[PDB]
Amino acid sequence: KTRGFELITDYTDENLLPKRETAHAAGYDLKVAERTEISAGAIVLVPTGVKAYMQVGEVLYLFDRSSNPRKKGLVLINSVGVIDGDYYNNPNNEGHIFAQMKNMTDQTVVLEAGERVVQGVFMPFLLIDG
Amino acid sequence: TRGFELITDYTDENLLPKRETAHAAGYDLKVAERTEISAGAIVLVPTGVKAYMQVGEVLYLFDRSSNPRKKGLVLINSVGVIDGDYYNNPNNEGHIFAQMKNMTDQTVVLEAGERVVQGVFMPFLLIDG
Amino acid sequence: RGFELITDYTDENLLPKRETAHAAGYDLKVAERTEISAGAIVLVPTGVKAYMQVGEVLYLFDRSSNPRKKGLVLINSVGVIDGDYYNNPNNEGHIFAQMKNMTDQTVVLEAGERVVQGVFMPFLLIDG
């Protein structure tokens, strides 16, 4: 056991466990855990149904999917989700990963359960002196 | 090992990215042909290049700092994630586009050769199994 | 690698730290009270510069709470702080966060407020 995703206790659909679309893709595609509506101009935390574990010195970044803005009118409003290794299994929400999405359009957008919403990439990070 | 090549549709070697300084992380990708972006619109801006890399490597595209405050443009998906197998794909040869939104109320024109995003190559890690 | 105060600031409270023992990011703070008008973009001073090794980069990311709590976003999405920005002759490598106020009221950032998170990472070079 090194790094990866697990379903949080609140979800049991293994379809939500992220996979890479191609053999050399950097990103794991996280999915919408339950139907989620986003009103015009609103920001909504979209549940992903999963938590992520990793090694010390590793981080998981969540990036928007390319098609979100031009096809769905949605953007990851904080640009990049920074998921720390100690978020996993925290006592507050078990490390459940949410995507903070904003609807840029003037009509309500609905994300169906199972739709891919962000891509996650695991990477090393470095520490400052001392 | 890793780097950029012109796609077959473009021949101006000026488009091949370089780093602005010797210790910069990013390679500056340029606009391949004059591209207009209407007020409030999102446009895929051609860069004229494709990128190859090793297994376990990814290329990220980031906005240039000056884009929003100087040009009124932003990279609307925030970070472009260019996978190693995008290179030479049968659909568009792995041609890298920058998805730019014009935040202003006037048409913005990007001239050929203008720097538009910066690309950084980095390692990534795989999940168990 | 690490952070130093620029010569213009002396409050060591501005030196970034990680919030938890396994966090990826160092929390950079607002160096002086900074107002951002409705819909405006403002370069927010952080009071620090960053040194690192060759082959290393410092990325600045938005704080999760900025958009939904404060109505602010890092307008260039990710700040890319190069190793040779440090001690440049123009501004000493002073790191600014380019923040946009999405709301219809002026937002004020107080000195000492956390504004972005910095992560140090390796990068790779092209052939030749």
TrEMBL record, chain C:
GO biological process: dUMP biosynthetic process; dUTP catabolic process
Enzyme class: hydrolase
CDD domains to which the protein is assigned, alphabetical: trimeric_dUTPase
GO molecular-function terms, A-Z: dUTP diphosphatase activity; magnesium ion binding
Key words, A-Z: Hydrolase, Nucleotide metabolism
Domain dUTPase-like: from-to ranges: 15-128
Catalytic activity: dUTP + H2O = dUMP + diphosphate + H(+)
One Pfam family matching this protein: dUTPase
Record flagged with keyword Transferase: no
Region forming the signal peptide: none
EC number: 3.6.1.23
Family per record: Belongs to the dUTPase family.
Protein's name in the database: dUTP diphosphatase
